[PDB]
Amino acid sequence: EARRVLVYGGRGALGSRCVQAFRARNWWVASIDVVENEEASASVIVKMTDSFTEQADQVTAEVGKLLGDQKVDAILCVAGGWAGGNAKSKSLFKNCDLMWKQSIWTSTISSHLATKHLKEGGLLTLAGAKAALDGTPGMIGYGMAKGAVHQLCQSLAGKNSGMPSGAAAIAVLPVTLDTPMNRKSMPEADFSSWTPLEFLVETFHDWITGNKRPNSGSLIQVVTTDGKTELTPAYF
Amino acid sequence: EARRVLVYGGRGALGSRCVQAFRARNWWVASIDVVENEEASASVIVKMTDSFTEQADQVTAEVGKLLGDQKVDAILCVAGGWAGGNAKSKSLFKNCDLMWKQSIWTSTISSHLATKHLKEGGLLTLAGAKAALDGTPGMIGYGMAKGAVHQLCQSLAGKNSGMPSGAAAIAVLPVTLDTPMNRKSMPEADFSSWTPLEFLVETFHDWITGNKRPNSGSLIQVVTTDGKTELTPAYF
Amino acid sequence: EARRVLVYGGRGALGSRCVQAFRARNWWVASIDVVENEEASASVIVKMTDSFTEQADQVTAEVGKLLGDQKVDAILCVAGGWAGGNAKSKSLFKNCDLMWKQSIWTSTISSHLATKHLKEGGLLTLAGAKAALDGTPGMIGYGMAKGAVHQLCQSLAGKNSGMPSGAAAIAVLPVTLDTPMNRKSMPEADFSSWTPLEFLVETFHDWITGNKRPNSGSLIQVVTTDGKTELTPAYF
Amino acid sequence: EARRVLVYGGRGALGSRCVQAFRARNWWVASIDVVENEEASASVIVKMTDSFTEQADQVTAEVGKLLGDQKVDAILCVAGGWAGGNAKSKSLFKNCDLMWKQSIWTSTISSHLATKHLKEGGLLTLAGAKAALDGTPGMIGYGMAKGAVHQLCQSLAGKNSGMPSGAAAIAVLPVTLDTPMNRKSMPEADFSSWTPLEFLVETFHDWITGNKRPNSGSLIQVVTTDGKTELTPAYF
Ligand SMILES: NC(=O)c1ccc[n+]([C@@H]2O[C@H](COP(=O)([O-])OP(=O)(O)OC[C@H]3O[C@@H](n4cnc5c(N)ncnc54)[C@H](O)[C@@H]3O)[C@@H](O)[C@H]2O)c1
Ligand SMILES: NC(=O)c1ccc[n+]([C@@H]2O[C@H](COP(=O)([O-])OP(=O)(O)OC[C@H]3O[C@@H](n4cnc5c(N)ncnc54)[C@H](O)[C@@H]3O)[C@@H](O)[C@H]2O)c1
Ligand SMILES: NC(=O)c1ccc[n+]([C@@H]2O[C@H](COP(=O)([O-])OP(=O)(O)OC[C@H]3O[C@@H](n4cnc5c(N)ncnc54)[C@H](O)[C@@H]3O)[C@@H](O)[C@H]2O)c1
Numbered sequence: 001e002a003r004r005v006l007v008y009g010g011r012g013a014l015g016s017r018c019v020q021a022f023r024a025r026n027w028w029v030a031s032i033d034v035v036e037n038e039e040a041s042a043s044v045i046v047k048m049t050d051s052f053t054e055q056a057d058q059v060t061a062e063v064g065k066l067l068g069d070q071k072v073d074a075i076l077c078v079a080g081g082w083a084g085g086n087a088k089s090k091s092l093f094k095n096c097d098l099m100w101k102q103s104i105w106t107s108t109i110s111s112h113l114a115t116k117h118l119k120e121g122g123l124l125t126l127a128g129a130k131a132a133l134d135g136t137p138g139m140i141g142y143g144m145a146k147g148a149v150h151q152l153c154q155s156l157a158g159k160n161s162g163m164p165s166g167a168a169a170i171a172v173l174p175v176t177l178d179t180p181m182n183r184k185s186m187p188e189a190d191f192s193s194w195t196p197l198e199f200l201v202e203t204f205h206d207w208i209t210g211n212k213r214p215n216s217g218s219l220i221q222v223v224t225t226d227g228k229t230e231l232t233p234a235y236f
Numbered sequence: 237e238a239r240r241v242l243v244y245g246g247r248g249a250l251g252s253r254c255v256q257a258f259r260a261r262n263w264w265v266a267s268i269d270v271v272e273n274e275e276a277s278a279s280v281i282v283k284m285t286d287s288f289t290e291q292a293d294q295v296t297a298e299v300g301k302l303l304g305d306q307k308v309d310a311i312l313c314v315a316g317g318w319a320g321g322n323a324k325s326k327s328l329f330k331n332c333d334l335m336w337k338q339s340i341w342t343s344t345i346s347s348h349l350a351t352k353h354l355k356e357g358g359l360l361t362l363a364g365a366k367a368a369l370d371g372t373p374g375m376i377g378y379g380m381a382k383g384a385v386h387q388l389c390q391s392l393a394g395k396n397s398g399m400p401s402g403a404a405a406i407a408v409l410p411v412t413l414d415t416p417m418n419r420k421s422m423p424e425a426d427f428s429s430w431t432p433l434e435f436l437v438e439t440f441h442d443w444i445t446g447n448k449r450p451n452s453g454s455l456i457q458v459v460t461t462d463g464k465t466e467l468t469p470a471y472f
Numbered sequence: 473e474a475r476r477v478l479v480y481g482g483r484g485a486l487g488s489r490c491v492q493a494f495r496a497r498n499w500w501v502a503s504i505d506v507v508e509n510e511e512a513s514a515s516v517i518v519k520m521t522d523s524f525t526e527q528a529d530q531v532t533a534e535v536g537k538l539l540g541d542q543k544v545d546a547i548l549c550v551a552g553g554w555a556g557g558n559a560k561s562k563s564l565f566k567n568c569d570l571m572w573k574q575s576i577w578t579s580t581i582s583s584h585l586a587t588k589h590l591k592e593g594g595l596l597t598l599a600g601a602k603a604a605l606d607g608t609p610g611m612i613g614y615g616m617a618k619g620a621v622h623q624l625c626q627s628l629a630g631k632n633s634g635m636p637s638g639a640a641a642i643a644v645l646p647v648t649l650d651t652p653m654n655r656k657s658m659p660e661a662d663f664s665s666w667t668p669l670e671f672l673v674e675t676f677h678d679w680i681t682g683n684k685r686p687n688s689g690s691l692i693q694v695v696t697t698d699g700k701t702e703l704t705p706a707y708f
Numbered sequence: 709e710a711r712r713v714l715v716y717g718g719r720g721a722l723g724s725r726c727v728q729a730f731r732a733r734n735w736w737v738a739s740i741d742v743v744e745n746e747e748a749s750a751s752v753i754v755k756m757t758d759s760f761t762e763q764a765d766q767v768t769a770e771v772g773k774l775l776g777d778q779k780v781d782a783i784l785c786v787a788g789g790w791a792g793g794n795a796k797s798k799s800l801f802k803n804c805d806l807m808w809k810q811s812i813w814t815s816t817i818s819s820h821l822a823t824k825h826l827k828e829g830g831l832l833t834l835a836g837a838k839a840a841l842d843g844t845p846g847m848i849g850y851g852m853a854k855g856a857v858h859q860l861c862q863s864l865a866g867k868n869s870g871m872p873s874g875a876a877a878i879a880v881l882p883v884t885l886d887t888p889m890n891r892k893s894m895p896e897a898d899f900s901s902w903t904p905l906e907f908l909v910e911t912f913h914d915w916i917t918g919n920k921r922p923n924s925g926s927l928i929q930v931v932t933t934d935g936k937t938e939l940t941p942a943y944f
């Protein structure tokens with residue numbers, strides 16, 4: 001059930017594949033990002049600023065004029081990334097602002113675009129990370145941004161949150177996805193414990209089209225061991 | 237057993253009461269807030285800026301000079317505030333920008349200053365909220381903020397976080413505090429279910445001065461019933 | 473407010489999604505169909521027979537054993553199915569026999585169990601159709617099978633019926649539920665007028681957890697215009 | 709203006725009287741029922757079976773053999789009966805089954821026979837009931853069955869049901885007919901209200917001979933107050 005999709009983080013490794021395969025199946029796919037994704041039906045360009053309200057208003061404004069009264073089947077917020085740093089760090093403040101702008105800013109503008117552009121029965125997927133289900137001493141910024149996003153699921157799953165009737169919020173919780181960049185930077189890493197980008201496209205495919213879709217509020221873990229990926233509930 | 241205290245959020249309702257209880261015991265108290273505290277030993281002024289890196293680098297420069305080589309006993313992060321609104325509200329991006337600046341920008345800089353300026357065995361307290369242990373649909377922004385602080389507290393409590401030996405990070409999680417503004421906003425409320433500011437200040441002295449302090453990464457729910465307040469832990 | 477639910481029709485398209493969401497809500501869901509449902513907490517297997525009292529006594533008996541002295545919060549009766557044909561049709565006697573078996577046999581056994589097994593205050597939902605509120609000249613068996621279910625919903629709402637005190641028998645009148653088979657079967661159709669199953673699962677959830685439940689003997693029309701689904705009262 | 713007629717249920721209280729009277733007129737009258745009516749020109753005897761398709765294929769092929777190329781002028785389907793019991797009852801299933809057999813099966817086979825045999829401009833009359841225009845809590849099987857017959861009658865009045873051009877299907881809906889066994893089961897009732905079979909043979913005869921005929925799909929309530937009996941439209 002799905003010929004309309006919004007991918008926040010459209011040019012980034014996983015979002016890019018979601019743009020590629022939903023077009024291979026003739027869905028209209030649109031990419032919200034800091035750059036244009038030429039393979040998308042359309043791209044919306046996010047404005048670099050320090051003002052959350054200023055980037056928030058320009059993005060919500062231009063998805064306004066692009067969709068008009070067209071609702072979407074799914075918004076997949078897959079924007080995100082990584083920066084390390086413990087609390088004693090040099091870089092703690094540079095990385096915290098990078099992380100907050102990458103997951104807490106993007107998941108909050110997407111949530112709003114959900115309450116306005118999203119179908120009843122539709123789907124908002126949020127980008128969590130399983131590291132954050134506990135203390136992340138070595139990456140304050142990361143854990144904080146993604147633990148914020150897991151609390152946000154619980155809230156959109158809540159009575160009177162703004163989510164369209166029958167639509168759902170599901171935070172996907174990876175350990176390490178498997179991108180060319182990750183392979184380049186973490187060379188001697190067991191790539192067989194990284195999830196393939198395709199298993200998440202496959203998963204958003206079943207979920208978007210009613211197939212075995214998990215309750216709103218759901219924090220779904222994605223663990224790959226030796227090539228085999230597993231989806232497991234986490235409870236907040 | 238303690239004498240040197242930082243209060244982040246020093247001119248707020250709990251912040252002022254901490255300067256007063258402690259100043260009148262002849263503790264050295266410095267206040268950090270966007271304005272001055274004439275009843276504190278010292279005042280650091282927080283520069284209004286949308287740049288988290290602007291403000292952090294500043295507070296860490298000014299606190300860093302005040303203290304020089306003196307390790308303080310306890311840093312109390314009691315900055316904060318409150319703003320409602322679900323994902324559909326029009327003022328959401330503004331109300332989220334406030335709640336992150338008051339609760340996410342301030343609890344992070346205080347985690348940083350604690351790795352740099354805190355005594356071995358000393359204490360950092362962060363201000364969380366019991367409401368955000370669950371989903372907060374009627375207040376998207378506020379539960380992201382406080383949800384991120386409960387996660388930060390788990391992080392500082394762990395291996396190689398940056399905290400000094402024997403130093404505890406503890407999050408206090410109130411349901412409602414008895415303030416003049418709560419009275420004036422929720423005028424027809426049952427004020428006996430509110431936690432009196434004085435309970436927390438009596439509690440901050442007990443944990444500060446060695447007597448009865450809990451573990452680092454403790455989330456301590458603060459609940460007051462018919463004037464009687466008990467404290468009970470939450471697990472993450 | 474509901475943990476125990478019987479889904480008469482547990483393997484069909486809508487009743488299936490009801491065993492999924494409610495077991496993921498850790499409710500006790502017992503499927504009642506012509507085949508076991510492996511996701512349910514229980515299965516009563518309806519023995520195929522041209523004798524009404526044989527199907528009706530083996531179901532009442534197997535469900536009567538399965539629960540014993542326990543009462544259930546709800547009996548969702550979503551069994552039904554469809555076949556066409558006018559009064560001249562050579563498939564008339566086959567189709568008619570199947571529709572009266574799928575909707576009158578199952579509605580009358582679900583009634584009877586509610587009087588014996590529905591918790592005081594509980595829900596029974598019967599499966600109806602918007603179509604059958606007027607004449608159905610192209611599907612005689614169907615409009616005559618649903619129309620009898622609409623008249624049953626009223627009799628249950630009547631004084632001295634057997635219905636448990638405080639309980640409600642509500643009927644649901646859909647035009648087209650969006651489902652797998654309807655997209656494989658009706659393929660150039662406008663899906664924007666088709667109800668997403670996830671909206672009826674959420675509604676069943678409201679009505680079962682006491683929230684916005686309509687009165688007993690209500691004919692609720694479910695109608696989706698442009699993706700927005702609405703519930704309106706029909707009067708018999 | 710009419711001389712061949714089938715009387716379905718033709719051996720029962722109004723069924724017998726339509727035979728006797730249309731015969732006093734010399735109309736060729738055929739009686740369908742589970743015993744032969746020796747007063748009519750030809751009697752079909754319905755096989756007592758559980759399979760709807762077994763009985764329906766047998767009654768259709770016997771009426772079919774008897775008439776061959778002959779179109780009839782009016783099928784008066786006056787078969788039926790009565791049984792009590794609300795949804796909690798012991799006898800619920802037996803009587804539901806009996807009432808479906810008597811009033812739902814018989815009426816669906818009449819309708820298939822009118823499309824095959826009724827003349828253009830001819831008449832099909834179905835036995836409905838005032839009681840079932842609303843809920844019937846004490847008699848669940850009876851109101852389901854008669855509620856099924858009211859719907860069928862709008863379906864047959866509709867476009868391409870298969871009814872011969874100009875023909876009509878009109879449901880008659882009594883409160884109580886004055887019958888001998890009604891006098892035995894109800895010995896003290898005010899019979900001045902019990903409609904007399906006679907008034908419906910008088911009326912069937914007018915409708916059959918085009919005199920003041922209701923439109924097709926009309927539902928005629930028949931209410932007798934104290935010696936006059938009025939026919940008034942009911943609506944779906
Ligand atoms: N190895 C992993 O990729 C990995 C590991 C753990 C968790 N997950 C998480 O799941 C999600 C999917 O993984 P990913 O590889 O696609 O992340 P990613 O880093 O590859 O994608 C980042 C996207 O965010 C965009 N961008 C950055 N800030 C933006 C902003 N404020 N507004 C609009 N665009 C912005 C970038 O242009 C980019 O398209 C991520 O959020 C990630 O943190 C992934
Ligand atoms: N009923 C309540 O007031 C209540 C209930 C539950 C939780 N809390 C939480 O408990 C804590 C203390 O309670 P409070 O009522 O005294 O709050 P408060 O607002 O009265 O005091 C906090 C002070 O922190 C300052 N602060 C805001 N932004 C800052 C920034 N960017 N840099 C430095 N300081 C900044 C504000 O100026 C304010 O004066 C807060 O974290 C609050 O959210 C309060
Ligand atoms: N588009 C639609 O699917 C649509 C439209 C209008 C109304 N409805 C009505 O809403 C209800 C649910 O829709 P649906 O698509 O899920 O129906 P469905 O046909 O897909 O499912 C009916 C299920 O109940 C079972 N059922 C049939 N006879 C049974 C019996 N005698 N004993 C026990 N179970 C029996 C069937 O085996 C099947 O698993 C149906 O009753 C249907 O009539 C559906």
Ligand SMILES: NC(=O)c1ccc[n+]([C@@H]2O[C@H](COP(=O)([O-])OP(=O)(O)OC[C@H]3O[C@@H](n4cnc5c(N)ncnc54)[C@H](O)[C@@H]3O)[C@@H](O)[C@H]2O)c1
Binds near residue numbers: 716717721742814837
């Ligand atoms: N008090 C009333 O007389 C009254 C009230 C309301 C409605 N009506 C309805 O009007 C109709 C005619 O009135 P009635 O009193 O003469 O009913 P009746 O019981 O006296 O006669 C009905 C006849 O239909 C036959 N019928 C039952 N099963 C049949 C079958 N399987 N195949 C063919 N025919 C079958 C019965 O054998 C019987 O011969 C009935 O259906 C009745 O329910 C009558």
